Amino acid sequence: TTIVSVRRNGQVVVGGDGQVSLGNTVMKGNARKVRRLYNGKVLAGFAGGTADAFTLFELFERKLEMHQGHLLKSAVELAKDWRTDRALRKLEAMLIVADEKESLIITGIGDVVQPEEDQILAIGSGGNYALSAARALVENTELSAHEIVEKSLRIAGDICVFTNTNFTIEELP
Amino acid sequence: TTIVSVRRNGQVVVGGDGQVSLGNTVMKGNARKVRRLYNGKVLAGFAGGTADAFTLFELFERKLEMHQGHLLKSAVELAKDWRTDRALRKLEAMLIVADEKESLIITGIGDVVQPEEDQILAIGSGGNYALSAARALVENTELSAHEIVEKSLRIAGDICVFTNTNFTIEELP
Amino acid sequence: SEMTPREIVSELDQHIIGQADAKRAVAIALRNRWRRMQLQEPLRHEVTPKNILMIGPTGVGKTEIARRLAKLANAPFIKVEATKFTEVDSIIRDLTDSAMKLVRQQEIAKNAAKLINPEELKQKAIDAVEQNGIVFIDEIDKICKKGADVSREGVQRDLLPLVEGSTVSTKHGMVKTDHILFIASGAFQVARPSDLIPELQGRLPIRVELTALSAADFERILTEPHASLTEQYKALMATEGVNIAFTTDAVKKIAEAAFRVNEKTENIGARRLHTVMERLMDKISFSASDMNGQTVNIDAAYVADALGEVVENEDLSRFIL
Amino acid sequence: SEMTPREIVSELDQHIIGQADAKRAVAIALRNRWRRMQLQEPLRHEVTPKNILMIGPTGVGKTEIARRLAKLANAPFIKVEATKFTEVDSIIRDLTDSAMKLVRQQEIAKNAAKLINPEELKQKAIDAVEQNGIVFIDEIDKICKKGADVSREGVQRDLLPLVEGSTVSTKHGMVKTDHILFIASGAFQVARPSDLIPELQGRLPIRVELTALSAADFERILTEPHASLTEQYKALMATEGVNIAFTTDAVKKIAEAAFRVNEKTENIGARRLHTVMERLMDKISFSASDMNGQTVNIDAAYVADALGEVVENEDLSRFIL
Amino acid sequence: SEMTPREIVSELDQHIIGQADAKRAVAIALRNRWRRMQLQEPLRHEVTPKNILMIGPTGVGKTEIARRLAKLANAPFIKVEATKFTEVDSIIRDLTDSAMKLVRQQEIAKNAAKLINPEELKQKAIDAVEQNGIVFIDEIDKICKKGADVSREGVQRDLLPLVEGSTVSTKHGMVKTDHILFIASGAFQVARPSDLIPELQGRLPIRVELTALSAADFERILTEPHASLTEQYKALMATEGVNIAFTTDAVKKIAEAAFRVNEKTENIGARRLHTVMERLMDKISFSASDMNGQTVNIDAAYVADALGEVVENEDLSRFIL
Ligand SMILES: Nc1ncnc2c1ncn2[C@@H]1O[C@H](COP(=O)(O)OP(=O)(O)OP(=O)(O)O)[C@@H](O)[C@H]1O
Ligand SMILES: Nc1ncnc2c1ncn2[C@@H]1O[C@H](COP(=O)(O)OP(=O)(O)OP(=O)(O)O)[C@@H](O)[C@H]1O
Ligand SMILES: Nc1ncnc2c1ncn2[C@@H]1O[C@H](COP(=O)(O)OP(=O)(O)OP(=O)(O)O)[C@@H](O)[C@H]1O
């Protein structure tokens, strides 16, 4: 898939395509790869293998529930359930999570990663495509977060054979 | 990555680049691969896979906490938790740890290694480059530990496609 | 002969701030107690308590409301953690000791001293239990399916008999849990109440939700309740001969602060006030002895100072790359 | 009628060197005991103990301070390891046996003797507990979340009732933990206090930190305290008829040494002094018998000699490559 | 009024061969018992036992030294394996029963009989315990961290109270472990003493080491001690009317033999002598009855013969390639 997030002007947007691909065939095209958590106050988009992607998401959620939705602490708490003696079980999936305050990228072997200065994050086979297009627009236009997301997503669905154009975009007032 | 450490003139310096590379692409360039432990009286730099690198680090820390910060004893205590009947779990990561008195290199399968006479240590894909550069400088100049670290780091970032030039250097008064 | 719904809520309003739905709920409950027992006899027995499941975050009044409900009804009471069993009949056994003491207390409140006769004193407490006893099961959401998940799921099955009404023997005789009013509380952050076993989910008809406490709520809890924290210190310092006074802005500041940490770190509800209050009454609390006659005027500046600085976490670094 | 904050701290200064914040803390605690019980009746019950969490390294005075606090307040006392439960009501049960013995001590002393009166005494002892009982939960940081992590996390939930105030039955009657003052101690090297369950983290309002003991501190512990180690040996050798004396530089040397090993190896606090003191009084301790009349003058040279040599470890080699 | 250091060592020399440091250690210990109790009262209570940790291989005297120490001090004694708890207060409870037989039977020597007077008999035993009781914890190195490693590490925490001084109830009353002298032994082949929990490692100030027994040592143990093995058989055969005598070379050969197997197989210290002695007095022990008047002269030839041949192991082959 291609999941990208841009944060600009007190706006945070996370968007992604909807192509569930099994092998070199396509099973579903209208998949929702970005969803809202903790009383819609936090966005989550996921790449990787379906199931794991889902378990990795449902996991972050229970954490969010136990920590008053503190995006940053929940991420770390969750990471710490892999970074210990008794492994949790490696999940082949990544999440891009974001709330009003932070944008974070969490992986299935436990390690939270912050964005670079530009505050842009993208994951998925077509991630770098969207990332490149996004960095370009953020550095060279006044386009809103939403527009850049929408725009980069397409530029990427056009290069990646695993990313389609049916988008699901969510922004955070 | 490239993590190198030179000790000269009652000074101990540990430095490393900041390139987190996923596959042959680059995810983050400003990563801090060297951090301070036990009330900033001990330096730690880590190479290897991100997560493991982190758990290997967080582990040595707990140990350091339980042993009044004795660098050498803590290393051994931690090593011994792999060198037994009930394995701990092989971690694909190495650390270079150093405090006022000692410099050490600890790995994730449990085994602490001391430097050779010259007191130089380096790890990571770009290790030997920094190591070669460092040995050269320590044996042929009066450059301070800090300078040699800074210098070698670059010479290596220039040869390794996985090491960049954004450094994070820490020295121990 | 007994308080009424509005009557009881008013009594509770004297100790708990907010949480109306909750108050109302336990009110109509304690009232249904007087309603039955007015009925003929066939129905008198047939009608049973409409148990309550309280759902709210940590320390927002769930327990005080129940403990006060029992207090103003002068009813045998008992609180137990559900996880405490991960002997359940002890719950009733303990509830009876409570009533036996609450009833010994009366045949003695009346005018050596042989206005006793155990045989009839026991029957007296034993009724108190069977009639108006109250059990409060805490953090029941901890024994919901969510592994040794059967060890806890088992605790539910173990509570059924009591809730579903049965008999258990106490060192005072036999008692029936048929009319004991049960109140279970839980936060239910991960588990939903519909995750309890059906047999039990239906014995807890009344579901009532409690709200999280706000800065504004704290402000009131700080001063309004009978024996609030401020009323307490005033009283204590008085003994050392010190006269203390809180300015409104002080109280406002204290609360704003409790709430502030509760938000930035682990939210522990109203308890947070005892925490901040003790950190402030810190210095005075000690010096108060040899400070007789003086009078401390605790305003905003004092509070701002005595509280020092409280942390907005560095989960940062260390764990993030 | 009772000591005062500054008054009590002065008493503690007679046995514990340093650790002021700590002393102050327990002082204002034992004081709030006299402050309440002066109040009318409604508040008299409403006001509860502000429990303490002492946080400091191994053997730096956490326990002595509490044991002495209880001693000078002539209060029932009991210490327990928190991990000891990985029957909790035993804690109160045991605290009561201590009291019965502590009150029965007053009777067979204020009267071939007989006053006994079972019904009389038992009541009075039970009151001593409920009123001024003190429980000391040691190494509570050991039952923090950090696996069978639920076995310990469970212990916390099991202590709540006592801390949160409840009733437990003793062979002397029923006692209420509502006003028992609790003091938990911990090193908290890995766990933070905020790792305790909220319900409990809020019942431990007062957090006080104790310092690690320094060479200079030992120097004082060695001689200042009532019945210090030096005062003790002096007294002991006196019996064999030997007169001993420690030069200042000796004491300085003994402590420099204790501290030295404590740093180089496993730091066990003040206990280290009993270790070094026994290794030094070694030779004298035996020959003291047939050495009557003489007088040993223990100076720096003596100590330097009697201590031999103590190790700066070889973790080296063996495990290193 | 009581023995002295050198005095006691001399007494122990009558039963234990070698192990001086050990003897000395327990000596000065029993002595400090008389030293205190001579002190006024403030210090009388403040001064505490300097517990001992004996570290030596299997069967080299660790226990006999302690058992005899207690015997010659006529003190309540008790030995327990540390692993026996992988109820700890039973240790004191048991130590107290020992004090009844020791006080009862001992005061019966004062005086169909009767003064008896139990509330005083008890009060007197309980003193003997609190005053000069001695606990011997065997193979304590077995509960060191080295897994259910917490099950054992737990046993250490469980012993603290007794060692650190506390109270436990016996069927004779309450006793305090504040002045019980503790002696722990261990081989410490794999674990070091510094592997014990600090709280405990500091309550065991005195570390003394025992040496392994050599052929030459056995030679003396065989004949010197009061009631040595040879002295015992001589005595036993005497009853059947047989007079036996061991030539020196015999004794030397018996010991060379014990030591020999001890080395070649599982080394079980001096016990090995009872083994070989019984294998040798084998034939005679039976026939002795109908062998009256005769006299057996056990020389080297005899022993060599009676012992047959003893193995230098074939771990060989079977498991080796
Ligand atoms: N809404 C409130 N009004 C007044 N006082 C309150 C209120 N909520 C809490 N308090 C005080 O703060 C404490 C809250 O404890 P309580 O037992 O009521 O919490 P809880 O909501 O039952 O939590 P849990 O059931 O998770 O322990 C009590 O001492 C109570 O007096
Ligand atoms: N500051 C001090 N002043 C005087 N004596 C001290 C001091 N600190 C420790 N000691 C002595 O050293 C010992 C310390 O043991 P104590 O149990 O009081 O320490 P602790 O820090 O509470 O240990 P734990 O880890 O068991 O809680 C006691 O015997 C006490 O007499
Ligand atoms: N040095 C010795 N002198 C005299 N007899 C000894 C000596 N060593 C051992 N014995 C005898 O051999 C036996 C030794 O057992 P003992 O239990 O005293 O040894 P130990 O070292 O305590 O062993 P454990 O490992 O069981 O503690 C006893 O019967 C004792 O009489």
Side-chain angles (χ1 to χ4, degrees), chain A residues 82-85 87 94 105 109-111 113-116 128, chain B residues 22 25-30 50-52 54-55 58-59 88-89:
Chain A
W82 262 298
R83 281 103 141 301
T84 46
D85 318 60
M94 295 204 279
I105 170 192
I109 56 183
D111 45 4
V113 183
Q114 290 185 309
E116 275 190 294
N128 300 307
Chain B
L22 154 59
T25 75
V26 170
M27 169 170 288
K28 189 168 192 170
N30 51 47
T50 62
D52 281 26
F54 268 72
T55 99
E58 272 144 51
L59 247 54
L88 202 185
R89 169 179 118 214

Side-chain angles (χ1 to χ4, degrees), chain C residues 68 79 81 97 101 139 227 232-233 235-237 239-240 266 268 271 274 278 285-286 288-290, chain D residues 4-6 9 24 28 31-32 34-35 38-39 43 46-47 50 157 164 198-199 201 203 206:
Chain C
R68 294 296 180 179
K79 173 176 186 179
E81 221 104 330
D97 282 332
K101 179 174 56 201
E139 267 174 359
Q232 283 183 73
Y233 280 111
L236 279 275
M237 300 301 91
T239 329
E240 288 303 319
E266 184 162 53
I268 61 177
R271 262 306 161 181
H274 298 257
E278 196 58 51
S285 217
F286 188 62
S289 200
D290 30 276
Chain D
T4 84
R6 266 196 310 90
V9 179
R24 233 156 159 288
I28 102 186
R31 184 59 169 167
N32 273 324
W34 167 85
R35 296 175 175 179
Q38 218 77 172
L39 300 169
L43 275 187
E46 295 295 338
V47 73
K50 298 299 186 169
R157 288 263 164 49
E164 212 163 71
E199 291 73 359
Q201 156 176 172
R203 291 289 337 202
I206 299 189

Side-chain angles (χ1 to χ4, degrees), chain E residues 118-144 147-313:
Chain E
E119 190 169 58
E120 191 164 293
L121 180 64
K122 299 182 173 184
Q123 176 66 295
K124 198 173 180 183
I126 279 191
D127 281 312
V129 182
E130 282 178 345
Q131 303 298 177
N132 353 277
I134 297 182
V135 166
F136 184 78
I137 289 168
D138 199 38
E139 269 176 356
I140 210 179
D141 58 322
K142 295 302 187 175
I143 61 183
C144 270
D149 179 49
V150 297
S151 302
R152 51 182 57 159
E153 167 117 353
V155 186
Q156 297 182 71
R157 288 265 164 46
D158 288 299
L159 282 167
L160 273 181
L162 286 60
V163 170
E164 209 159 73
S166 67
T167 302
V168 308
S169 178
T170 65
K171 67 182 180 183
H172 299 286
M174 296 292 263
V175 310
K176 318 206 308 168
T177 59
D178 287 60
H179 292 99
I180 297 295
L181 161 70
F182 291 86
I183 301 182
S185 59
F188 286 98
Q189 313 183 76
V190 279
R192 292 151 275 181
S194 55
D195 277 21
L196 288 156
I197 62 175
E199 293 72 0
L200 189 59
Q201 155 178 172
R203 294 287 341 204
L204 297 185
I206 301 183
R207 315 302 183 62
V208 47
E209 186 153 298
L210 282 82
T211 56
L213 264 16
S214 84
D217 290 307
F218 283 155
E219 284 179 47
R220 307 180 49 210
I221 294 199
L222 228 26
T223 68
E224 304 200 7
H226 275 192
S228 61
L229 279 183
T230 59
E231 175 179 353
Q232 283 181 73
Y233 278 106
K234 266 185 166 69
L236 280 272
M237 300 304 92
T239 324
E240 288 303 326
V242 183
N243 174 278
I244 179 171
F246 301 87
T247 88
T248 289
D249 292 303
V251 172
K252 209 157 179 307
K253 180 76 181 185
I254 294 177
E256 235 93 66
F259 181 90
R260 213 220 170 209
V261 353
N262 253 23
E263 177 181 301
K264 301 302 176 184
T265 55
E266 184 160 54
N267 181 322
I268 61 176
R271 262 303 162 184
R272 186 65 68 186
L273 296 173
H274 296 259
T275 288
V276 186
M277 278 303 285
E278 196 58 51
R279 200 157 90 218
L280 159 166
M281 297 311 296
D282 198 325
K283 308 69 190 169
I284 295 172
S285 208
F286 191 62
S287 319
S289 195
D290 29 275
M291 196 187 260
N292 186 308
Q294 307 192 191
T295 76
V296 199
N297 187 259
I298 312 197
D299 51 15
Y302 194 178
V303 172
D305 158 277
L307 294 181
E309 291 178 50
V310 181
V311 235
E312 54 177 359
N313 291 320

Side-chain angles (χ1 to χ4, degrees), chain C residues 229-250:
Chain C
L229 278 181
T230 59
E231 174 178 355
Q232 283 183 73
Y233 280 111
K234 267 186 162 67
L236 279 275
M237 300 301 91
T239 329
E240 288 303 319
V242 184
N243 174 281
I244 180 169
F246 298 84
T247 84
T248 291
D249 291 300

Side-chain angles (χ1 to χ4, degrees), chain C residues 12 54 61-73 75 77-79 134 136 183, chain D residues 164-166 178:
Chain C
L12 300 179
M54 285 193 226
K62 277 186 260 57
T63 307
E64 259 299 82
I65 296 182
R67 203 182 293 284
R68 294 296 180 179
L69 185 69
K71 197 58 191 299
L72 77 81
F77 181 81
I78 173 54
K79 173 176 186 179
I134 300 177
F136 184 77
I183 300 180
Chain D
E164 212 163 71
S166 68
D178 287 60

